[PDB]
Amino acid sequence: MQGDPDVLRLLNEQLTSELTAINQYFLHSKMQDNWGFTELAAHTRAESFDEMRHAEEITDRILLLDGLPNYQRIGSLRIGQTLREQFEADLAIEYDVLNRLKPGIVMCREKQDTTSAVLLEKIVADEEEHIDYLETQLELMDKLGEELYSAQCVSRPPT
């Protein structure tokens, strides 16, 4: 069996939006960790692993279609240097992915690959939550005030 070249591209293009996100997210939590937002550190680490889940899932698909999953390339990481920054820098990829995955899902249905369509419908819903979350952190950051908010991300005492 072989997979359709325009899917293969859309997959291997999500594969990278994954590889890309894995690093930022990971590194972002490790930084959250070093500044001392350990509570929050842990959760950014959580989302990070979630993306390695997605990559491994996309990878699984490509090989089934008999394509060559691309681990070699990467996206351009926005790397926030404050909490706020980082959330933005993250929403950054998240939306992109959505922007990339909407028409690609229908592209799939046209191409008649129901399995890869559902792979991507799921990533969408997953990511939408990541988004609603990230952007909520913001909604809340202004309601509370960076400062105050930030102590909601440390242990007692910190680290």
- Tell me the binding residues for heme b: 52
Give the up-direction half-sphere exposure of residue 103: CA atoms within 13 A in the CB hemisphere: 4
Cα separation of 106 and 150, whole Å? 41
- Using alpha carbons only, how large is the chain's radius of gyration in Å? 17
| DSSP 8-class letter at 10 | H
Residues 48-67 touching ligand HEM, rule: CB under 6 A, are: 49-50, 52-53, 55-56
| Residue of the chain from 11, 19, 65, 108 that contacts ligand HEM (CB under 6 A) | 19
Q: Is 151 in the site for a second copy (CB under 8 A)?
A: yes
Answer for which of 7, 60, 89, 100 binds a second copy (CB under 8 A) is 60
C-alpha–C-alpha distance, residues 107 and 109, integer Å: 6
Locate the DSSP E strands across 18-135. none
Q: How far apart are CA 93 and CA 110, in angstroms?
A: 26
Residue 9 or 57: the one with the smaller Cβ distance to a second copy is: 57
Using CB under 8 A as the binding rule, whether residue 5 contacts a second copy is answered as no
Binding mask 28-57 for a second copy (x = CB under 8 A): --xx-xxxxx-xx-xx------------x-
Query: Where does this chain touch ligand HEM (CB under 6 A) — which range of 21-29, 89-97, 125-133, 134-142?
Result: 21-29
> Cα–Cα distance between 53 and 15 in angstroms, integer?
11
Cβ-contact 79, 27 below 8 angstroms: yes
The interface with a second copy within residues 103-122 (CB under 8 A) comprises 103, 105-106, 109, 112-115, 118, 120-121
Q: Which residues bind ligand HEM (CB under 6 A)?
A: 19, 22-23, 26, 49-50, 52-53, 55-56
